[PDB]
Amino acid sequence: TNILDIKQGPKEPFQSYVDRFYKSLRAEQTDPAVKNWMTQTLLVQNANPDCKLVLKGLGMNPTLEEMLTACQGVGGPGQKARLM
Amino acid sequence: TNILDIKQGPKEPFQSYVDRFYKSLRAEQTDPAVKNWMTQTLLVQNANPDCKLVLKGLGMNPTLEEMLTACQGVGGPGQKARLM
Numbered sequence: 505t506n507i508l509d510i511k512q513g514p515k516e517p518f519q520s521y522v523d524r525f526y527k528s529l530r531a532e533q534t535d536p537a538v539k540n541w542m543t544q545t546l547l548v549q550n551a552n553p554d555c556k557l558v559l560k561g562l563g564m565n566p567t568l569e570e571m572l573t574a575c576q577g578v579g580g581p582g583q584k585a586r587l588m
Numbered sequence: 589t590n591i592l593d594i595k596q597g598p599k600e601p602f603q604s605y606v607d608r609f610y611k612s613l614r615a616e617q618t619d620p621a622v623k624n625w626m627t628q629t630l631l632v633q634n635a636n637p638d639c640k641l642v643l644k645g646l647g648m649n650p651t652l653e654e655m656l657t658a659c660q661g662v663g664g665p666g667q668k669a670r671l672m
Contacts (some may be wrong), residue, residue, distance in 0.1 A: 520627075561660075561662075563654055574646065
């Protein structure tokens with residue numbers, strides 16, 4: 505049940521947060537159907553405001569790769585490399 | 589060739605920019621293959637920095653609906669409604 509407390513830090517890169525989220529998820533997952541709901545709903549809800557904004561803009565059922573791509577650099581100065 | 593000069597304003601909503609972009613595009617489009625390239629490359633390049641960031645995070649070949657969804661409210665205080 506610790507997965508409900510896994511929350512992204514204000515300056516933590518999304519990749520680091522995802523890594524910690526899936527480590528606790530893979531250990532204590534109850535059902536394969538519950539695990540799917542955690543990866544597409546709970547993961548977004550516990551992200552920081554900067555990444556939570558980007559994730560909610562991704563529409564329905566975003567894959568993990570699409571989330572990692574969209575959140576790369578988000579929350580710091582690194583995302584500005586997209587603009588050049 | 590005016591389509592190359594259609595650029596999103598710093599405070600213009602993405603929906604307004606898309607509307608102006610497609611109006612000029614549908615009039616002067618040369619090839620159906622050129623039109624496809626303008627909707628997925630030129631549209632992103634001429635967006636403002638706020639929306640250009642979000643669009644480049646969408647990965648490969650984003651549909652117009654996915655772009656409109658991701659950019660809703662981006663560039664103003666309206667996007668914060670996602671976080672609550």
